[PDB]
């Protein structure tokens, strides 16, 4: 598990160089934005239970065959596991937003999720369709354009943290494809 600081040391260890100079000036501007990243992880963890129950319900309203007899989200034992399967994905994305590096997402959650879901009979078309709803919710909460709740932040721009959290959620959908 690497964070954003461990990545620039592994890259410098391959050539056996001391960290200094231009990549020390790229690191001082990563911490200048370090409060925006801390402001924005909090704006997702605070809304984490409504983000999941809206994404699972919105996957169901598009495909109501999942709640038919014989559907994958049919019984109460299987409905409670999709609500659990879908908030572990959101939990591991919030680790990657706090760390600033998608290493912990890629190996503790995504490595082998596709082979697991097509061994339990889980439709990977619908799992992509719930992950893409959680992507639209996380970009709305970070840019503070939710229609259901407006948070309080200092004034400024956080469109690079929205580009980063969309790349993590696109990678979840591409992995379980």
């Amino acid at each position: 598990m690497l964070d954003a600081f461990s990545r620039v040391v592994v890259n410098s260890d391959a050539k056996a160089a001391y960290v200094g100079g231009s990549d020390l000036q790229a690191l001082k501007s990563f911490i200048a934005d370090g409060n925006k990243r801390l402001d924005a992880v909090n704006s997702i963890v605070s809304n984490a239970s409504c983000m999941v129950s809206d994404a699972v319900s919105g996957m169901i309203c598009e495909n109501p065959g999942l709640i038919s007899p014989g559907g994958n989200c049919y019984t109460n034992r299987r409905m409670a596991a999709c609500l659990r399967d879908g908030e572990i994905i959101l939990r591991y994305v919030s680790y990657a937003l706090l760390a600033g590096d998608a290493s912990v997402l890629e190996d503790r959650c995504l490595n082998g999720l596709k082979e697991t879901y097509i061994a339990l009979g889980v439709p990977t078309n619908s799992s992509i369709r719930a992950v893409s709803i959680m992507k639209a919710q996380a970009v709305a909460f970070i840019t503070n354009t939710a229609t259901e709740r407006k948070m309080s932040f200092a004034a400024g721009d956080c469109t690079s943290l929205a580009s980063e959290v969309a790349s993590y959620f696109d990678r979840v959908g591409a992995a379980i494809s």
Binding site: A4, F5, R7, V8, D23, Q25, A26, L27, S29, F30, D33, G100, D101, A102, S160, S163, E164, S167, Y168, D170, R171
Partner: protein
């Protein structure tokens, strides 16, 4: 899938100009001896330097300009500065009157202006 330190270090390098903190400035020198073939202008570049010694001719003189203001020691009140990390020994002739402030007193020497 993204590198956060690479694509924000590149985004801060093209928006921010490379020239700010280097403290260079165009120093212009005019030479004129009255004649026509004596009138060069030299706009060369020098890194200017923070002159440490002549700030004490400004920082101290304004610290005694504001010491003697009766109506800028009120409406401009200074904060409550703590003393340093000196330890109390027990004898008052070292505690209250230490060796750095032993026998020090201000002498005022007025003249014309």
């Amino acid at each position: 899938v993204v590198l956060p330190v690479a694509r924000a270090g590149l985004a801060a390098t093209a928006k921010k100009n490379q020239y700010m903190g280097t403290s260079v400035a165009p120093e212009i020198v005019l030479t004129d001896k009255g004649s026509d073939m004596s009138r060069k202008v030299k706009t060369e570049d020098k890194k200017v330097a923070a002159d440490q010694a002549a700030a004490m001719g400004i920082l101290a003189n304004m610290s005694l300009y504001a010491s003697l203001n009766p109506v800028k020691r009120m409406t401009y009140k200074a904060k409550e500065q703590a003393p340093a990390y000196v330890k109390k020994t027990g004898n008052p002739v070292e505690d209250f009157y230490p060796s750095s402030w032993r026998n020090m007193a201000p002498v005022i020497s007025l003249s014309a202006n």
